[PDB]
Amino acid sequence: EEEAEQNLSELSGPWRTVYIGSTNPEKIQENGPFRTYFRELVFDDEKGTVDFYFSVKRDGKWKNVHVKATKQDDGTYVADYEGQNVFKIVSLSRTHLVAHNINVDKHGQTTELTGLFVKLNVEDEDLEKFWKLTEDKGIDKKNVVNFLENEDHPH
Template sequence: KMKVLFLSLLLGVICAAQEEEAQPSLSELSGQWRTAYIASSNLGKIKPNGPFRVYLHKLLFDDEQGTVDFYFFVKHKGKWEYKHVLGIKQEDGTYAVDYEGKNVFEVSHASNDILVAHNTNVDEHGKKTVLTGLFVKVNIEDESLQKFKELTQEKGIEEENVVNFIET
């Protein structure tokens, strides 16, 4: 009985250790990222000159402070603007972000090379928009693209509302 108990405990520890390796801590994800895809329940938010047609430059996660700094480019009235927006970690692990209204941002899947996230935006008119994004450090793997597509579908966003940022 003790051997079975010990082996079960050992197996549990190994599985937990492997899970931690598969999903790095957010602070380990800090660095330069680029936008690969963004999808939105409201296509107007990600069309050219739309407020969420963002070209991500850098993310800085601070686990100790409970913050994330977003650095990105967005076109406003035909001109490129460089933006810095701060997110504050909430008890549920999401980040509250003030940008074009109130946002709830969450990393859904991450590795050293890809980051799949979703964001719920409520603008100044009370209109709710759900967005998903795939951000990369290098070229996208098919598996990563599949995770993004699954999350987008799960969040109820139509496939025609997906914008490929690599090809634009």
């Protein structure tokens, strides 16, 4: 029985959107800029930044987008994406993230958003069980596909 030491950087990895709510429905409608499907998040304690990787549809086409946010002394984060944004983490753990985002667009219109995201956790012993099983059946390592990374880097 052992567990990895908790470090903010240990929260980095694949994350997925569960729910997103908005005071302005147009922002999260089909082709809305905030109807974002999360791919991965990278937390950096030393630089005080969070990098967001997500996908969103625009002009009927899916786009891969990266946004870097910077921590403020008040602990909140600022990011530029379809206007200015102030992002606040309401609850966080090894498995979930609940946040509140304030957006002011290029016309001075304000929208407040709430979101629930969850982390996809892959443990070491489970990976080991899969690999031992795979060699037991005589399957070559080049004969296995990583589905998780394909979803994290769609097109």
